[PDB]
Amino acid sequence: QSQFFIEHILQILPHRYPMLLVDRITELQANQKIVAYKNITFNEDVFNGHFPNKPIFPGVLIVEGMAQSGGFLAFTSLWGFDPEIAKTKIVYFMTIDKVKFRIPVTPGDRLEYHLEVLKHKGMIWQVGGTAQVDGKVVAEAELKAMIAERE
Amino acid sequence: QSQFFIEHILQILPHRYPMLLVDRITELQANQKIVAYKNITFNEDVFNGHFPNKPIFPGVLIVEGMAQSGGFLAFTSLWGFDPEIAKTKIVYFMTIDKVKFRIPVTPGDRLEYHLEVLKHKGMIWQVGGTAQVDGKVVAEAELKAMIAERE
Amino acid sequence: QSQFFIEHILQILPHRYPMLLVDRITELQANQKIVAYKNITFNEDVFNGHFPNKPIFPGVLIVEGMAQSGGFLAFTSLWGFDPEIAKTKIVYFMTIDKVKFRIPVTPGDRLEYHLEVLKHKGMIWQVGGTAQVDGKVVAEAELKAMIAE
Amino acid sequence: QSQFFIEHILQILPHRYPMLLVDRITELQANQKIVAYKNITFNEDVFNGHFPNKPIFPGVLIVEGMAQSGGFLAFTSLWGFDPEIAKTKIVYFMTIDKVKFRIPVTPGDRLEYHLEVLKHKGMIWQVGGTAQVDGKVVAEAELKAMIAERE
Amino acid sequence: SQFFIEHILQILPHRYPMLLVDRITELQANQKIVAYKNITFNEDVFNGHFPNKPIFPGVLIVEGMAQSGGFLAFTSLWGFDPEIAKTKIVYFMTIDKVKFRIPVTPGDRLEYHLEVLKHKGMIWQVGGTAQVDGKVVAEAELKAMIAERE
């Protein structure tokens, strides 16, 4: 498949509320790239404290979202859409690099994650790309994550 | 006068997390109509129980967002964007009729509120319209509120 | 039966925190009616924003509670207390009508749900009734929901 | 007054969500007794973890509710309904004794607090009593509180 | 003798936001236990206890001593056995001689020191203190009964 909805994400990613930051996948190409997004709404708990009266989606959380997008890409390229295998996996961050934040993200925004694979061996995946709102680069970052069996 | 953001929505509506269901206002015509929206993300608490493994934004909360939109419309018609006066008024919602649900709303949907003034007689405003997602009508509703002095 | 506790409701309704708005079933007549309620306390997250310094249970949630009650009836009427079958379904709102909010509900209130089946066929159930607090009616509503897999 | 509702409690107790455990006060006799209650509903965050699929209101939290009631009783016995002064004081427990849990408190329950004044000298208060559900004792405890300066 | 959060999760039925024991540092069957809970501002409870002045609730300090004691009593009889842990429930009958001396705030490491005072059958009575930086912030005694869950 090339497009996945929230019920499909829940069967692949280990993340859960309040750390599942990818609402839908709009594009996917094995071992290559992925385009996904997360809607930003005031009705999110993080806004309670970031910041009071000035809702700003955290920058670290944008990185997380891109990372989670990559994870999806990594997992499905590996075993395809196999919920049963995905059931017992988790994803560790290994390294984060070269992130610039250019525009603040706020409620009402559609935070689009654009990720490409820079390199990958076995379970280690090096991804890089951007976060975009209304077609403008709101953030850029590259990260290396690791798919690991829960034990 | 037309485009209001979450910062402005916070200054007019008393609603706060997790009951403020309007992230942005794309346009409003005094005494006529309003178009606004709320992003629907999985990272909202309500999805924890509605329902496990099948996130579906609660039908009643669509009506609430709609009511919220009409309320911002009625208020702004009377005094415009005025936070000081807003702190002194309340909009009791008296009735709701003819609400119909056609399509479930899910994480990743841009829930758009379309409300128009149906009858403005005194302190009583009556609005109606639809909630839309991607051009389609996902819900309909009629509503009647009353403008009153806060206490 | 006719009396059900949270322990039972959990096994029938698919809802869970913070959207299971029925705490106990007091009276239940297959395909006819049901009386249940949800206790209202300040210790609910909803009150953080509805509203600050002035806690008021959302009107729309009172309808939700009425619907949930309707669904518990709709379901038991057709399969009795069947936790296994119950978990192979979910109930969803089709239409809401003639709702009125006469009295604001607040922490300390025992929001009682009174629903009777107006019409029902297959998974399609039409119910209507009131929401009550200490005898007085605080809300009225008619709603139609459907039970699906 | 002898009957106070949540808005009143809110002006007297500093406690707030999710630690304000008293919804209403039905009887208040200065320097003597107070009777209040807290509604228990499945819709409370505590039930998520106490316990999964077996909702049971924490015994220690019952005590806390008895104590907050005592605190209200203590303060109002002294300054009456004086919101400005309450804002400057705070009640701390010093001791808790003879706590006995008899019946589990569950959703749908109306946890009624019956607290009476055992001893009161200045800012130091001793109160015994019980938490009741439908006229049956579900818990009992004694505690000595202190009225201190918020600063 | 040293159990981390995961082990605790297999023994205690408590979950967020009511599992108030982060780690067991030492344990001795029928004798004592020392465990602790970290206190951080990042806890929901502080939103209301109290606004502008974070003070970990004293009743919750007691709840943590209870869970520690409950853990002590369970593992003393059955050791680290998650399976039998699901068939038994440890609830508390009485709590007595509770005393608060110092307030616990964010940044503190709330250490639980519980002793087995007496035990006969499934009735276990434990007591001890709550400590931070080697000082006593609280003390209490509790009587628990171990029963069949399901």
Added chain:
Amino acid sequence: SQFFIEHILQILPHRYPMLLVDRITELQANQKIVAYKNITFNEDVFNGHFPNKPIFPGVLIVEGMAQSGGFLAFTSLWGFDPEIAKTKIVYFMTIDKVKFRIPVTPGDRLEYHLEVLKHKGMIWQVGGTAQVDGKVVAEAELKAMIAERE
């Protein structure tokens, strides 16, 4: 010497559940800062990160380090001035050279160690590590910007 949670509240705009620094144990203007945050199971973030396997988000470690530098930034600029503080916010500009070596879990005392690399006006570039029991759990570099809440 030591700044506690209520001091932190008076300088940092961050609040629950995004205020991830519990205490400042060391501070030296225009040079370095050592602070920490307790990690407990009783934090909402652990419900989804990850179920049955609590791991403090690596990204939140960086956020904790960023806030630490934030406090070093406010103070180095205007000292302990709560009045000026209440008017600003902090924006993330860049993050770089981050590496996670050890997983942080409930029970850990997450210590932040940051030093100033370069600063001008409201723009600050800091770097350092996050430690647990004297071991480097993670390292990173970041540049943030303090701004008027205009």
